[PDB]
C-alpha cells in the first residue's frame, strides 16, 4: 500500500551480478525483451519495490 520508489541515477545495469544471489521466479518484461536489456541505455529508471 505504501510502496517505495527511488531514482537509480548513473549506473551500469548488469543483472549478471545478481545471478548467485537469488533466482528470480518472475522476470516478465514489457515493451523490452530481456535479451536486449544488456544492449540498452535508459534515461530514467524507477524501482517500485
Amino acid at each position: 500500500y505504501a510502496w517505495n520508489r527511488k531514482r537509480i541515477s548513473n549506473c551500469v545495469a548488469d543483472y549478471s551480478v545478481l545471478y548467485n544471489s537469488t533466482s528470480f521466479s518472475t522476470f516478465k518484461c514489457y515493451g523490452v525483451s530481456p535479451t536486449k536489456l544488456n544492449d540498452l541505455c535508459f534515461t530514467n529508471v524507477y524501482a517500485d519495490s
Binding site: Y19, S23, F24, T26, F27, S33, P34, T35
Partner: protein, 49 residues
Amino acid sequence: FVVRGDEVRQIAPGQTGKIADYNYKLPDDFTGCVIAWNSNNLDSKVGGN
C-alpha cells in the same frame, strides 16, 4: 537435464539468466516442446544431491 524450479521458466526461446545464458540457451526457432516436472522425489538426497 535437471534444473532448479524457479529456473524452469528460463527454458524458453527468449530468456535471460544463468541457465539461459551460460547453460542451455534454447534457440529462437525452437519448434519443439518443453516438458518439465518436479523431481524432488527423485533428484534430492536427505543430505542434498
